[PDB]
Amino acid sequence: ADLEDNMETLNDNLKVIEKADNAAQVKDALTKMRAAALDAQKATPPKLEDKSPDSPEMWDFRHGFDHLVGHIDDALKLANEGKVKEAQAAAEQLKCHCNACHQKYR
């Protein structure tokens, strides 16, 4: 629902992916992450509450989720092919992007 909930969903499901036993488990976790990222994209983070909704910072925040979703969709392709280790490695690529948004806006 709220931004913090979406972030907890992202964090929890990344851990699910790391411990997963098959690619369908990775797929199910990635699917939840995709929805949480799109929900978070509609939020205004506390650090930007005073900025204009049309500000460059707000568009940058939103675009961070578009890039994250693209990564999730690429990992989903691998998971849907049964490639568990590759899909797990693709999911780890997410982390630098999580951190880059946090450095600016957390």
Per-residue binder mask for ligand HEC (CB under 6 A), 86-105, x = binder: --------x--xx--xx--x
CA–CA–CA angle 1, 64, 84 (5° rounding): 80
The candidate with the shortest Cα–Cα distance to 67, out of 42, 34, 39, is 34
List of residues 6+ apart from 76 with CB closer than 8 A: 27, 30, 31, 34, 87
Calculate the dihedral angle through the C-alpha atoms of 16, 22, 26, 28, rounding to the nearest 10 degrees.
Answer: -100
The encoded tokens of residue 50 equal 């005073």
Is residue 15 close enough to count as binding ligand HEC by CB under 6 A? no
Toward ligand HEC, which CB reaches closer, 83 or 97? 97
d(CA 88, CA 55): 35
According to CB under 6 A, which one of 17, 26, 29, 64 is a site residue for ligand HEC? 64
Is residue 7 close enough to count as binding ligand HEC by CB under 6 A? yes
Closest distance of CB 104 from ligand HEC, Å:
8
Nearest-Å Rg of the Cα atoms of the chain is 14
* Region near ligand HEC per CB under 6 A, out of 10-18, 20-28, 50-58, 75-83: 10-18
Q: Is 7 annotated as a binding residue?
A: yes
Residues lying near ligand HEC in the complex (CB under 6 A) are found at 3-4, 7-8, 10-11, 14, 45-46, 61, 64-65, 68, 94, 97-98, 101-102, 105-106
